[PDB]
Amino acid sequence: VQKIGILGAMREEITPILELFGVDFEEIPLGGNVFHKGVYHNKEIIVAYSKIGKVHSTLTTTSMILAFGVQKVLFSGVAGSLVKDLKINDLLVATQLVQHDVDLSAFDHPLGFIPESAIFIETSGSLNALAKKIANEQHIALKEGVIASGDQFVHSKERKEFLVSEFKASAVEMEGASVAFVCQKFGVPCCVLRSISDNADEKAGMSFDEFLEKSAHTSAKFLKSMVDEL
């Protein structure tokens, strides 16, 4: 059968995923993560939260691919908005991702760039198109854009402005670029889906605490609607 990996960063991002699928799961620990393995609509679904940030998410994605043999990875979670048109609860899919905190400018490399890699990492056009189709049929707004990932929770106007000017990012989070990077290295289709929890400004901690649960649920519900069409 088809094997689909489903990832969040925090436990709160996968709790609604496990509940919404509503099937039994076997828990399999590996590399400090717990993988929930279930069968849903004739597909094997493997659900896990990575824990926060780039190292955690790189490890979990690599484990999913190498140890569980998943054929697609769908990431669902929350994100900070960098643009006026992405408001609390709104959904976006990443067309490209960047590691916004990478800085080898001492050697005149562009910010975000590492030798033998690239600034922007692409996701699956096919999965992004599926998301768009579903969103239109459900009459849900869905934006497509660049997501910036780094190992800092962004809560300042100055950092937002940098992300917009340097990378033209629409949202910020801490895991998407690493998940997409790993998938691309192994030829595995990847979709990164996020629901806005905050505006990545001085009020972001507050907003995040308020909206984590609801925004996570919104993302999870949409991810399920995608899996229903795969």
Next chain:
Amino acid sequence: VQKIGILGAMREEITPILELFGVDFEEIPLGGNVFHKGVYHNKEIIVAYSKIGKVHSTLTTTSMILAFGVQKVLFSGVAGSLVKDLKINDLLVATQLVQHDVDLSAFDHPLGFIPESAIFIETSGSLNALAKKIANEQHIALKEGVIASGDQFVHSKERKEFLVSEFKASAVEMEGASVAFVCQKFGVPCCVLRSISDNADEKAGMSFDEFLEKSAHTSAKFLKSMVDEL
């Protein structure tokens, strides 16, 4: 037989390793890395460069463990010095590592800390003690201390001061903490060995360009002397 993973970040860090072992290697590509597999003194050695930074090094380490089944990981490369007593070419082993660019302080977490993890990641006391024994027998200076890892090349007095005050780091680099983190998650002994290439200050790019080859060779030679005793 015993399987030993040997990692550098850049090709220049593993070129001397491959030459110094002086055996034939089979090249095995996986996840965008090339793994050089050889037999040396009745051990299987698997050598690779990860490419620069935390995501690259997390992926390569995870691959080494999950796909090649290595039982120990030794990292060899260069680093920026944060302390007066670590000069160009000097060797150190990391007793602990930290991800110095992790910042969840918006939620009053200490810098370097991520929920469900820890600020400091430990390495193998047994391998560090072997390194110390060998260094003493060869009449080579070998320091032990905290190494700070992040996704920026550090070349400023201000950032050095932060690393010293916040984490009491002795050296800075971009991969050690991720390698040690992965190893710890999988119960695999890890040793991170670095030779100083620069002082992580405004002159660091210059110094790095000058000393990369020599410092890499110094680290590689010491790593080989460790493998000779394993």
